[PDB]
Tab-separated table of C-alpha atoms and ligand atoms in Angstrom:
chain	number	residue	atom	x	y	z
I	1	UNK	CA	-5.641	11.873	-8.655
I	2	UNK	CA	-5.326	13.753	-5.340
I	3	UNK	CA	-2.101	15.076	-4.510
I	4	UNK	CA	-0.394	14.926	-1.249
I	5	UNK	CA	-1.057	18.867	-0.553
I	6	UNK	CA	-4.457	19.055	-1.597
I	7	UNK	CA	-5.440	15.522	1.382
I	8	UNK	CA	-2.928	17.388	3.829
I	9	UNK	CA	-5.446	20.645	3.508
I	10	UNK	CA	-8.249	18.834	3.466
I	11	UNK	CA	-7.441	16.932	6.853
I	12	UNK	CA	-6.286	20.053	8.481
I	13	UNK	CA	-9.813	21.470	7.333
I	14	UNK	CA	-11.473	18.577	9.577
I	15	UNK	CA	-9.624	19.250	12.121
I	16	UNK	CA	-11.603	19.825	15.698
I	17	UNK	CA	-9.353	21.218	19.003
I	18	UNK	CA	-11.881	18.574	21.074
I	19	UNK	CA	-10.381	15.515	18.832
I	20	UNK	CA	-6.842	16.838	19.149
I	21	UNK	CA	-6.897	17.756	22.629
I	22	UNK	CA	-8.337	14.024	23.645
I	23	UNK	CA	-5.714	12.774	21.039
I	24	UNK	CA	-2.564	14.655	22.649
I	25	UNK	CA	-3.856	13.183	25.826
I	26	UNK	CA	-3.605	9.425	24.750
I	27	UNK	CA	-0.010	10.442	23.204
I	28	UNK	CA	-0.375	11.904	20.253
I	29	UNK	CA	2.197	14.796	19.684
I	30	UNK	CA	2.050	17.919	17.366
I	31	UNK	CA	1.588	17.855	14.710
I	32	UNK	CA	-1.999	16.529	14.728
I	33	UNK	CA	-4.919	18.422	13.526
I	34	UNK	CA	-7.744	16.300	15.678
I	35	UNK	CA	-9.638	14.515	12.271
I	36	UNK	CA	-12.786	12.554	13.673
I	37	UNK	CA	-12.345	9.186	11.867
I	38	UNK	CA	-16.199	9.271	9.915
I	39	UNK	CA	-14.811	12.633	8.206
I	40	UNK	CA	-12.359	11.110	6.335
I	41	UNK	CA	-14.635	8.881	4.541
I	42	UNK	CA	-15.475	11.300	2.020
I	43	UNK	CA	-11.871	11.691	1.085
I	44	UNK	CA	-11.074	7.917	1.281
I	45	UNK	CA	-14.054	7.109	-1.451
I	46	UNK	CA	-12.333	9.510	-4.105
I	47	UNK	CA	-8.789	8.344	-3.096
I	48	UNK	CA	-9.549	4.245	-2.884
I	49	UNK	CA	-6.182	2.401	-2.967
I	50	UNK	CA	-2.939	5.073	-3.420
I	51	UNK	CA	0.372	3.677	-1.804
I	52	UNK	CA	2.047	6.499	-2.867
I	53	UNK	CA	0.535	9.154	-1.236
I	54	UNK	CA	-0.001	6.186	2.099
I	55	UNK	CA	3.633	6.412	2.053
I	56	UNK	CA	3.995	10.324	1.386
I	57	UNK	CA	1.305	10.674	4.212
I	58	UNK	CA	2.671	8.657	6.544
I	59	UNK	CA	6.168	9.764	6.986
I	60	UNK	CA	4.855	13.306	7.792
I	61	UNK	CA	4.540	12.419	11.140
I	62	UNK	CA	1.343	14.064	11.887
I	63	UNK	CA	-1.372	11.348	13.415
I	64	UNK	CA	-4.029	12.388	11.114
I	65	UNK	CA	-2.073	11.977	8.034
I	66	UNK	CA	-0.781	8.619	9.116
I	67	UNK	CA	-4.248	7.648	10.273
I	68	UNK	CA	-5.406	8.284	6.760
I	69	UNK	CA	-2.573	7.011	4.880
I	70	UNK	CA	-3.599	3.495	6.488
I	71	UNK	CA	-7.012	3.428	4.957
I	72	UNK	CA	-5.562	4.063	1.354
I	73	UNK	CA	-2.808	2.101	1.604
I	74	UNK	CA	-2.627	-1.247	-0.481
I	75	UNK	CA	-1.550	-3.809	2.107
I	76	UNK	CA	-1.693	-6.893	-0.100
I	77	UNK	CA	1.026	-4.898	-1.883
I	78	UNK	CA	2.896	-3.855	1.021
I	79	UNK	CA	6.131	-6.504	2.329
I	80	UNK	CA	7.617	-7.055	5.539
I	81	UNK	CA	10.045	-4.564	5.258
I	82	UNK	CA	7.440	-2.317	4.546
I	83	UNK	CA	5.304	-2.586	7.789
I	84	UNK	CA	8.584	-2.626	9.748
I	85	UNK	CA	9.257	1.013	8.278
I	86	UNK	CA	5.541	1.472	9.362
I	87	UNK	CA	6.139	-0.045	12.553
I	88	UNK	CA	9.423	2.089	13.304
I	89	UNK	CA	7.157	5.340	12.943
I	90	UNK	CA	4.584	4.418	15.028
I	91	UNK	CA	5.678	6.086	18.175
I	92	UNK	CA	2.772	5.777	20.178
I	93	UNK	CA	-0.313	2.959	20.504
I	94	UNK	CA	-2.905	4.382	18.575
I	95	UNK	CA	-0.615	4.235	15.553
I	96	UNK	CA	1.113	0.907	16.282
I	97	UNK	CA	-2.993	-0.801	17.527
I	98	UNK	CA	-5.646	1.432	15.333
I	99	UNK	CA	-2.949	1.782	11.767
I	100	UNK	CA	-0.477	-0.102	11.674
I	101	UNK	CA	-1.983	-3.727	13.102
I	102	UNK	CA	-5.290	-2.874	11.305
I	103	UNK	CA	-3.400	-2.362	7.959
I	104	UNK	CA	-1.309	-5.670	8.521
I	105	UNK	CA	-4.487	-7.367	9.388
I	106	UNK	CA	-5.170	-6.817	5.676
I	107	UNK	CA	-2.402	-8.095	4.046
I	108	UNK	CA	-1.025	-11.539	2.883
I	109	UNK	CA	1.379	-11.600	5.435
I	110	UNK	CA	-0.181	-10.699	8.948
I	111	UNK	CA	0.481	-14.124	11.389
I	112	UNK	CA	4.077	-14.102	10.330
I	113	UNK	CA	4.431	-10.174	10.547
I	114	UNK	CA	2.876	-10.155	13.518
I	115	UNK	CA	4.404	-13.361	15.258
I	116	UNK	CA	7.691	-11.727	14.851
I	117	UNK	CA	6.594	-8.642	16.036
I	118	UNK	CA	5.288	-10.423	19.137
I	119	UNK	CA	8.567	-11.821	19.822
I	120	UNK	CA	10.687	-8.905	19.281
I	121	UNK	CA	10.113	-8.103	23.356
I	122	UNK	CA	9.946	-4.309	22.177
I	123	UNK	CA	6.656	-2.506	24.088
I	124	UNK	CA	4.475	-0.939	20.550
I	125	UNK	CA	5.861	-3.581	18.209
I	126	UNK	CA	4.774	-6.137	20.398
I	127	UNK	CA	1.265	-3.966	20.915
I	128	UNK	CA	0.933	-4.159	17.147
I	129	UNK	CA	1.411	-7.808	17.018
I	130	UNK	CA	-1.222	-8.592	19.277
I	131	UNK	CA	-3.789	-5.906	18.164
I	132	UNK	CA	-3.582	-7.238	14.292
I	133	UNK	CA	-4.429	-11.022	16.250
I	134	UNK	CA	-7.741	-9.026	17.785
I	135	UNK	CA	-8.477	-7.305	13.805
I	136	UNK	CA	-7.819	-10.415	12.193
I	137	UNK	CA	-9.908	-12.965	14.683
I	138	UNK	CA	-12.978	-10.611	13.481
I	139	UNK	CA	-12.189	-10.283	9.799
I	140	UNK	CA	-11.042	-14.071	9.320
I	141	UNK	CA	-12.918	-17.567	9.538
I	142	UNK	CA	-11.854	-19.772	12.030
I	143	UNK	CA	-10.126	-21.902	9.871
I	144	UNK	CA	-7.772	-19.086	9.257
I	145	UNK	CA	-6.025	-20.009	12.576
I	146	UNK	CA	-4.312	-23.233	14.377
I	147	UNK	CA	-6.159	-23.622	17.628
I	148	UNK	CA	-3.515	-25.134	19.349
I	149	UNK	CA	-1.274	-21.939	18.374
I	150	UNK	CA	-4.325	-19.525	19.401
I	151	UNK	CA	-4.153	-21.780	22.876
I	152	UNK	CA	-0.702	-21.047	23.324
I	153	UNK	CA	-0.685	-17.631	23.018
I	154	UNK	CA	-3.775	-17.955	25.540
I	155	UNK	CA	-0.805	-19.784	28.277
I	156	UNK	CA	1.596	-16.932	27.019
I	157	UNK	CA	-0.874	-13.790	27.855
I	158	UNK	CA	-1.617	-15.626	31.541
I	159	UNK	CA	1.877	-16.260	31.812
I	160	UNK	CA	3.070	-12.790	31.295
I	161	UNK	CA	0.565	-10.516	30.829
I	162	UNK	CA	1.178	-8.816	34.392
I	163	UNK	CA	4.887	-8.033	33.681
I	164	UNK	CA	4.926	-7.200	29.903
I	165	UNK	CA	4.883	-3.240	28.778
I	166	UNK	CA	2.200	-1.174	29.551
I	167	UNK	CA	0.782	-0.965	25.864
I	168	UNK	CA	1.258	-4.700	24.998
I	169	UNK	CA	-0.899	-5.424	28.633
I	170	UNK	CA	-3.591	-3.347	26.565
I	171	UNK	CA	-3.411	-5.605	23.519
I	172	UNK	CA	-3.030	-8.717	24.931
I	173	UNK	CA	-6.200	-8.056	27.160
I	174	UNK	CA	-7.666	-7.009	23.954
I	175	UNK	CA	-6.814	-10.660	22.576
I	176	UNK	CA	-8.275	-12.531	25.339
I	177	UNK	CA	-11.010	-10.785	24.890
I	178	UNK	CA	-11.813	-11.091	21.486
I	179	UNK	CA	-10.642	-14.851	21.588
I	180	UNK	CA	-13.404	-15.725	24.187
I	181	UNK	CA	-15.948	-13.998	21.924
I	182	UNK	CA	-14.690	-14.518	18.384
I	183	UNK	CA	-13.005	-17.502	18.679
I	184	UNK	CA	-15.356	-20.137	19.501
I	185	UNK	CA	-12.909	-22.961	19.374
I	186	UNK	CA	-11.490	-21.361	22.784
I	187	UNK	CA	-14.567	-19.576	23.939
I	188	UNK	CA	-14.327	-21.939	27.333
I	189	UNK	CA	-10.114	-22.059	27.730
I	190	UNK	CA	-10.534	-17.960	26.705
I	191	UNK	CA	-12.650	-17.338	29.916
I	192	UNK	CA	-10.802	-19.307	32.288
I	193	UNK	CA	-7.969	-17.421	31.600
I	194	UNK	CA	-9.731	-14.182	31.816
I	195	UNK	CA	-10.729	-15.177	35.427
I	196	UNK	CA	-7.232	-16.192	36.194
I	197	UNK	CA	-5.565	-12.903	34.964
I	198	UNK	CA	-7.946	-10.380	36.711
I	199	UNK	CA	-7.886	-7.102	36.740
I	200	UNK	CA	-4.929	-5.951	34.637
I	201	UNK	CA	-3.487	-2.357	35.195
I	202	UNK	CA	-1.987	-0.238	32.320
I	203	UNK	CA	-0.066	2.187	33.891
I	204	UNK	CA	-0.016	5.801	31.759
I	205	UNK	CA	1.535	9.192	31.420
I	206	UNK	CA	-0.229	12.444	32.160
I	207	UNK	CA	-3.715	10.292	33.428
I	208	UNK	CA	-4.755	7.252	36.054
I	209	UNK	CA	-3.884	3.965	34.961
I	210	UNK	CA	-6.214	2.368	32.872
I	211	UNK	CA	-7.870	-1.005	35.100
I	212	UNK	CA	-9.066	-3.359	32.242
I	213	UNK	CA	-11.448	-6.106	33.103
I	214	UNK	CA	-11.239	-8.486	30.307
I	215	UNK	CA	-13.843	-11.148	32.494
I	216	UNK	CA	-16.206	-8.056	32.946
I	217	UNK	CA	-15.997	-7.050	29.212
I	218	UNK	CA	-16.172	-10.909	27.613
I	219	UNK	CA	-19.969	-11.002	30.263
I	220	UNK	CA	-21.508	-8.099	28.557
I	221	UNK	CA	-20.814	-9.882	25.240
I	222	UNK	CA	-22.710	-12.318	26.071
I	223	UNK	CA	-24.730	-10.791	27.728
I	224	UNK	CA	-25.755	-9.114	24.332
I	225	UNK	CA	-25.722	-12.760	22.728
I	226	UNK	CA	-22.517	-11.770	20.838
I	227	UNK	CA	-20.732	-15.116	20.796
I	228	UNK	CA	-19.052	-16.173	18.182
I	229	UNK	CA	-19.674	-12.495	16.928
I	230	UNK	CA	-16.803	-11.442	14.476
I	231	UNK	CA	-16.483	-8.082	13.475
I	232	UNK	CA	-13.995	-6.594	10.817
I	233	UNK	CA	-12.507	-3.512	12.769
I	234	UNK	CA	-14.616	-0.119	11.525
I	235	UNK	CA	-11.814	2.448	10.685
I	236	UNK	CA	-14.126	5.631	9.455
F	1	CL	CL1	-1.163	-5.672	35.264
């Protein structure tokens, strides 16, 4: 089996100064080597399922290595305290949104992990929570969720949504979004509350704030006919 040295040369290998440069600029901080996600499929077919090395990979520190260490990890075999370690390291959004959530939104335990994480009021563990709602509304049947839960956390993104943390403003506009379109239950209550929470600003370091539209962005869904479209996030 492949050992932690060998992956960590082969992701260096793949790495591009374009990739890293746009990755330093969302947050990412050395070390990174810049790995376009569809490179690491190559590696990820040998590897499969290895906690091990997720584990060894991840507590480098370097984005790449913890990006990767999410696709081989074995989440059905990872607890609670596990993703909270995972949680801890993720010190900026694309590790608590794009590995963290998307690994909990493969495991046995991702609506209580990520209820509490919601309600812990801190800014990326509450961006996680959220996100792994988005991953697991497109990788889950309906009947997966309680609607008048979903509805509620609807009321709590209108509610608050202007005065929570920059990142969790992301995610939460993320889950209205993908509630209107992948969660036909609340398609209608989804877009109201779209229209009622406008434009939502996240505020950034080292670029312009970021003004998401979630009304805009649900409209070209259906414009392309995409309701009740539900897609299981693509990670390579
Ligand atoms: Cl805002």
């Amino acid at each position: 089996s492949m050992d932690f040295k060998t992956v960590m040369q082969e992701l260096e290998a793949l790495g591009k100064e374009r990739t890293k440069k746009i990755y330093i600029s969302n947050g990412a901080h050395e070390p990174v080597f810049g790995v376009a996600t569809g490179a690491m499929k190559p590696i990820a077919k040998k590897i499969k399922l290895n906690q091990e090395l997720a584990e060894e990979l991840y507590a480098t520190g370097n984005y790449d290595a913890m990006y990767f260490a999410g696709i081989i990890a074995d989440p059905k075999a990872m607890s609670e305290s596990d993703f909270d370690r995972w949680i801890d390291g993720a010190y900026f959004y694309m590790l608590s949104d794009y590995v963290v959530a998307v690994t909990l939104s493969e495991s046995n335990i991702a609506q209580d992990v990520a209820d509490k994480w919601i309600a812990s009021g801190d800014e990326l563990k509450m961006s996680a929570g959220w996100s792994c709602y988005c991953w697991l509304l497109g990788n889950r049947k309906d009947n997966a969720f309680s609607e008048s839960k979903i509805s509620d956390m609807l009321e709590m993104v209108k509610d608050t949504i202007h005065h929570s943390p920059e990142r969790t403003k992301s995610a939460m506009n993320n889950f209205l979004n993908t509630v209107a379109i992948s969660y036909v239950p609340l398609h209608e209550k989804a877009v109201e509350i779209a229209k009622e929470v406008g434009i939502v600003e996240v505020k950034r370091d080292n670029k312009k704030s970021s003004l998401l539209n979630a009304s805009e962005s649900i409209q070209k869904e259906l414009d392309r006919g995409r309701l009740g479209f539900k897609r299981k996030y693509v990670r390579c």
